Amino acid sequence: MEIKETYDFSSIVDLWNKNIGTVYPMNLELFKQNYINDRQRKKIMGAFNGEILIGFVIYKQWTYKSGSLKPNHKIGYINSIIVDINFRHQGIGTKLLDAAEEELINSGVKILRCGSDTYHFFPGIPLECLPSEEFFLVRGYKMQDYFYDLIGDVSKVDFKKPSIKDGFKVNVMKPEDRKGLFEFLEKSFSGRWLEEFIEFFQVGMKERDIVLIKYKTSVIGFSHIYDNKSSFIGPPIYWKALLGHNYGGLGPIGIDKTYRKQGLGRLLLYESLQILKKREVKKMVIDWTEKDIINFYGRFNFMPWKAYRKATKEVK
């Protein structure tokens, strides 16, 4: 057996699906979109028996800015790691993560994260990969809290419009709103979400995927919505193969801090969901939510669907 770099995307995806495809079905389009467009220092290391790929790890160091966050070179990420089912418990996973980690460490990493990278596949260790928690524990990762993808079928429920206090308008974005939108993000969400707006517009997000809420003329919040016409495969629709015809998604969503807790997030969410409904969306997902916010979406009939555990290793 040898460990060496591979960018044999088909073989990786094939191995991915054979091992975990029932619950994280992967396709080449998503795999390539996410791997190729990422701007971090990144690598894929494979484990090989001769010419046969038997496992891999994808890993990154935070070397590229997130909006007005500077990169923190101390942070590295394990995007994914899978050893083929017929080669488990032979130390291969170990050798792969050793190689990843030693490299990150030599280049200055001191905090190693399970998922949560830019162009992530996973917010953390999936519950479906719960037994890997012990693999990570043994290597010095500590297990922390959970995030959840939520699922709902917006074709099945009708909801009541929240009561519009006046001045506030919710609308699908137009090209000429881009200036205002960026101005709002620099103020309120100037980190990764800003960076995602910039990068997603570059990779095929369209104005139709964005809903804005304005007070008078000022942008004071947004959502990103997805359907089966969206060009960019974002996190809500990663696992669209599980979601049927007329799939969709939503996230992220935010309101200017000074307008919070007046029912405006609820209004934006309502309107975003009506747009999706009108687009004939059925099952749809809201990705990477925290526990404390689940009820916000649950009023609209969304339920936790997948769970992911945050996990972090501090380099000694």
Ligand X SMILES: CC(=O)SCCNC(=O)CCNC(=O)[C@H](O)C(C)(C)COP(=O)(O)OP(=O)(O)OC[C@H]1O[C@@H](n2cnc3c(N)ncnc32)[C@H](O)[C@@H]1OP(=O)(O)O
Ligand Y SMILES: N[C@@H]1[C@@H](O)[C@@H](O)[C@@H](CO)O[C@@H]1O
Task: Summarize the annotated binding site for CoA as residue ranges.
Answer: 6-8, 253, 255, 261-263, 265-266
**Omega of the bond leading into 175 within 30 degrees of 0 (cis):** no
Which 114-173 positions form the footprint of ligand Y (CB under 6 A)?
none
131 in contact with a second copy (CB under 8 A): yes
d(CA 251, CA 232): 13
**Contact residue for ligand Y among 287, 302, 309, 310 (CB under 6 A):** 287
The encoded tokens of residue 296 equal: 């916000």
**Contact residue for ligand Y among 77, 121, 288, 302 (CB under 6 A):** 288
Q: Tell me whether residue 21 or residue 108 sits nearer to a second copy (CB atom).
A: 21
> Which parts are annotated binding residues?
6-8, 81, 83, 89-91, 93-94, 129, 139, 193, 196, 253, 255, 261-263, 265-266, 287-288, 295
Which does residue 115 touch among ligand X, ligand EP1, a second copy, none (CB within 5 to 8 A, set by kind)?
A: ligand X
257 in contact with ligand X (CB under 6 A): no
21 in contact with a second copy (CB under 8 A): yes
Q: Is the distance from CB of 268 to CB of 211 less than 8 angstroms?
A: yes
> Which parts are annotated binding residues for acetyl-CoA?
81, 83, 89-91, 93-94, 129, 139, 253, 255, 261, 263, 265-266, 295
290 in contact with a second copy (CB under 8 A): no
38 in contact with ligand Y (CB under 6 A): no
Q: Work out how close the CB of 207 gets to a second copy at its nearest, in angstroms, rounded to a whole number.
A: 29
303 in contact with a second copy (CB under 8 A): yes
86 in contact with ligand X (CB under 6 A): no
Which does residue 251 touch among ligand Y, ligand EP1, ligand X, none (CB within 5 to 8 A, set by kind)?
A: ligand Y
Q: Tell me whether residue 55 or residue 66 sits nearer to ligand Y (CB atom).
A: 66
Name the residue type at position 296: F
d(CA 42, CA 76): 10
80 in contact with ligand X (CB under 6 A): yes
For a second copy, the binding residues (CB under 8 A) are 17-23, 85-86, 88, 127-131, 148, 151-153, 156-159, 283, 291, 294-295, 298-299, 301, 303-305, 307
